[PDB]
Symmetry: C2
Subunit: 136 residues, 2 copies
Amino acid sequence: TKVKYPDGFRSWYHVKSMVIQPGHPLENPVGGIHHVYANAEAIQGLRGGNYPDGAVLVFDLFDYQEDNHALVEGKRKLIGVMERDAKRFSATGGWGYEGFGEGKPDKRLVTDGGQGCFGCHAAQKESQYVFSRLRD
Amino acid sequence: TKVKYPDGFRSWYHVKSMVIQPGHPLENPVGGIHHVYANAEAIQGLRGGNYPDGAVLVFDLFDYQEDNHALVEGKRKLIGVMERDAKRFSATGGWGYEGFGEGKPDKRLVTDGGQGCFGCHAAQKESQYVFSRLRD
Ligand code: HEC
Ligand code: HEC
Ligand SMILES: [Zn+2]
Ligand SMILES: [Zn+2]
């Protein structure tokens, strides 16, 4: 019933990025530069196939510094993780939701079985609870 | 003596990202959100080895739209490409420097055999002419 830490996610496929700056509704708690990563199984789902069990998506969040009209990546704040298991994570739509503080395997963040996460991702039922779109 | 178009670069290892905002000394031409990618061979150099022939680094530049203090990726503006070949690219320190407008293989940007590119990258001779640092 727990989400596996996604070991080696930094070597996976880079889906997309975004910057969330102060004044953005979501600046607490996902302010910063984020990168979405997808393992091979998650790419099947992102391309418009179905997500196999074992699909993992990672939201990789960095603090940033202002450096002379540049935003420069600072420390990692956290990662968010969605792991596909239709049976084991059926209470949250077939995805397990977990957060790791500073991307550390020992700093698990989710306390409610991922019901809060799922609460928002549920809006994306039609794209199997994934916001991120594959781009060129 | 032309740099090959790095087909498949979007499936490569994501090294790092940076936002260059208007007013940066290099807004013309690299204003936008950029993502650096490395093929397997380029990873060897980023980790502290010698860059082998066939190492390729890509600078993937996107426009962005500031939308309610999110910076949202728009269209690709260009890619920059460094291709390692100690013999063939000897005049520019063993890297071949090319740009592709909108990331299209038909839209070569470099017109001076890469001397201007080399002129700036020479400052990084001690890190084999590479600015980007591999981060976890
Ligand atoms: C709305 C109020 C959200 C809540 C609460 C959570 N997430 Fe979410 N997440 C949200 C958005 C708008 C996005 C897209 C970001 C973008 O750049 O487009 C995401 C994305 C993720 C991802 C990447 C996969 C995807 O769906 O795009 C992961 C892995 C992810 N989120 C995990 C996650 C977890 C673990 C949450 C609870 C701790 C959680 N999210 C909350 C919107 C919202
Ligand atoms: C200084 C005035 C530069 C000139 C002219 C060119 N480049 Fe360069 N480039 C520069 C910096 C500071 C960086 C690092 C960006 C970062 O996020 O840290 C880069 C990066 C690249 C890369 C990625 C590999 C690396 O060295 O980090 C490539 C592939 C690259 N640049 C290509 C490139 C080409 C093709 C150029 C002439 C058209 C060129 N650059 C010019 C600084 C400067
Ligand atoms: Zn200024
Ligand atoms: Zn703003």
